[PDB]
Amino acid sequence: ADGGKVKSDVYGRVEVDLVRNVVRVVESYDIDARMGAEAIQQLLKELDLEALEKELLEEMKHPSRARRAKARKRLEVVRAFLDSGNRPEWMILEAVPVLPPDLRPMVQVDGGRFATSDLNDLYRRLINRNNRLKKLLAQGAPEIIIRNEKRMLQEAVDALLDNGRRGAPVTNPGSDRPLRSLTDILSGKQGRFRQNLLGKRVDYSGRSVI
Amino acid sequence: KGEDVPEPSVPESFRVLVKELQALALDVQTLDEKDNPVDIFEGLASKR
Amino acid sequence: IEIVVRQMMKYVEVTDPGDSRLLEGQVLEKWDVEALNERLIAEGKTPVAWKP
Amino acid sequence: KISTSDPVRQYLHEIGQVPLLTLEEEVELARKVEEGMEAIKKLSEITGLDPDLIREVVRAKILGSARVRHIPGLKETLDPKTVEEIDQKLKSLPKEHKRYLHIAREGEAARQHLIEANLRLVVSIAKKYTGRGLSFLDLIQEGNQGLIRAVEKFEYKRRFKFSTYATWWIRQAINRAIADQARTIRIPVHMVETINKLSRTARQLQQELGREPTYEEIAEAMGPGWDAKRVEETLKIAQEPVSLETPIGDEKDSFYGDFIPDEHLPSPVDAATQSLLSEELEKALSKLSEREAMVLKLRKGLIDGEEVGAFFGVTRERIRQIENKALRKLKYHESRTRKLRDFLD
Amino acid sequence: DVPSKIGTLLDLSATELEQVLYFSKYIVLDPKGAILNGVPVEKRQLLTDEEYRELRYGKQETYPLPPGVDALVKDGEEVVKGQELAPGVVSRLDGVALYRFPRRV
């Protein structure tokens, strides 16, 4: 192969110099080095619970309390998976669903004033990024930019599922208020849940002095 | 018209929950007698 | 105060397994279930030893 | 741990490791970037494989294996057979021809370093287009989107240094990135500018009078086709959308949302109306002679509400004919049994 | 989540490995990696940016370019093209360039 990725014998990097026949051979190899959800996703794919389960069965009951104690909290989860559950490769994301539209409105307020939920922006956030990631991966890019964007891509993906977990993003200045993340809407984290059991409104109700 | 009231459909809070939950990786399905699906959002979630 | 109370006890720890490993903490009767079907019907008793 | 300190540290290091000579090495990699295109355009003049192919298989040979062509983009190209067979054709090229590939490779290679180097230049500019609506890392990011964009356009033969050439592009990038991703609602660049001036004049207006200008004063100041109607119209769009969720009244649990009613839905006294309307209209719809009734039941009623293109094949005269007589004969038997009188709608 | 379910199933630093590999490039040696850092391939153990660089591009990449004009320029050419420059070669001009790394120039 020409100046570049050229896996030779135990040494695998070849630089060319057509001046004098000098087939440069720098010495690295097929050292699969990955970072980000990738390596994780991979490491999970290549798992066969049945093996790790039995391995800990031994790891557990025999070694000293020390390395056997952890081995148990470790087998507990593995088992749940391995049970009637859903095979554990899906804890990773490669496709984020998208809450409906009318469930995060783009309303008319006071004339020019528009009304929009705090999640549509935590999405545009992603969308733009995810794309940007793609354009630059096409555009052909130096390394320190792919990861850096990949990084930022991570953030946003959490930021939409659940904010503040690592950091608290904010609509551009005016509101230092956090953007309403998903489970937030679930837990009623901002005094929402309570209200949910604080009541709902009956259809044919009344009140008045006794 | 003078007839008993139709038994309750699904609670918007629920539904809003299920979708507000799928919003996150997770997946909340509803099952019958046998661990097989039951369609709360009737029809709508079928694609196209 | 006897009702609510038993709901503070309706939990038992595990030590001598069979199905799933030891220290699990599970409902008192759910264990009256497995234990009951292991020494009564599906023989070869696996006396789940639990702690209140 | 807290981002940017890393993403800046990430290239301060590499850059800090290879700051390409202001002229020399920028020229080096520069030269070794044009002979890339030259080469490839010529390879294509021999392989028949589109410039895209030659340009795509040389990158996958240097930067990333099959893995890179599989995830970032699906499988249009076979991880094995496709690429390998394409490069297989580059080795079959004679000495004279295999010559350019060896160039094409080192070149793209040259495109790598050059870009990685000037990554400090990006953040420098980026350090100013900060407050708009784009994250700082984001800013940097679309900032690189102009730098690597420079790499294609530069002309080392024209002696002007590189750093300064990237400047323009880069700033161009960040700017489009500001007009695009900064808001929730998209407005054109034309209106974008039309908004700055309209906000820039308000400035000199705050300067004197004391009265935050009426849409008359601001309109004059601006210029030509600017009518008081426009400014009141142009500013409503200026203001940024308001949170559907916001502490309402005595800020407590009460969320701003419950305050906005609904409409698409027929509030019971509307559904109840359909059942009477629909059942009654259809009823009178059965004591009519099929024809016109149907073509007008299906015309206004079915597809979309042209007396001419109305009835099947009979002319307009028999259309109106039975029309105004049937319709009206319809109206006077209903008026009797007062079913539809009370305007349900 | 306190109980790192991807840190438990994967005996990776329950909360520190992932934490250091997820949000950046503190690479984990997924499949093989034949070569050594003195020791064989760390099947499931991570390495530094600086060390990964020492793998890919081999050990060294230094660019000690000379000062003045007719100085070190004569110690270079004469002792650069082909000469298997051992570790610690002593270029002799401005200060003392130090070619402390192996095989070829």
UniProtKB/Swiss-Prot annotation, chain B:
Belongs to the RNA polymerase beta chain family. DNA-dependent RNA polymerase catalyzes the transcription of DNA into RNA using the four ribonucleoside triphosphates as substrates. It comes from Thermus thermophilus (strain ATCC 27634 / DSM 579 / HB8). The RNAP catalytic core consists of 2 alpha, 1 beta, 1 beta' and 1 omega subunit. When a sigma factor is associated with the core the holoenzyme is formed, which can initiate transcription. It comes from the Bacteria. This is DNA-directed RNA polymerase subunit beta.
Curated annotation (Swiss-Prot), chain E:
DNA-dependent RNA polymerase catalyzes the transcription of DNA into RNA using the four ribonucleoside triphosphates as substrates. This is DNA-directed RNA polymerase subunit beta'. Belongs to the RNA polymerase beta' chain family. It comes from the Bacteria. The gene is rpoC. The RNAP catalytic core consists of 2 alpha, 1 beta, 1 beta' and 1 omega subunit. When a sigma factor is associated with the core the holoenzyme is formed, which can initiate transcription.
